[PDB]
Amino acid sequence: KWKLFKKIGIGKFLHSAKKF
């Protein structure tokens, strides 16, 4: 239960936001 849960798959997630 830490702030890492908000980055378990979001940091590299926004990387796809570039194709959109």
Q: Please tell me the distance from the alpha carbon of residue 20 to that of residue 14, in angstroms, as a whole number.
A: 10
Method: NMR
Please report the DSSP string for 1-20 in residue order: --GGGGGTTSTTTTTGGGT-
Could you give the C-alpha distances from 15 to 8, 10, 19, in angstroms and in order?
14, 9, 8
* Residue given tokens 């590299």 in the structure block: 12
Sign of CA dihedral 12, 13, 14, 20: positive
* Cα 13–Cα 3–Cα 5 angle in degrees, nearest 5: 50
Residue 10's alpha-carbon distances to 17, 18, 19, 20, in angstroms, are 11, 13, 15, 16
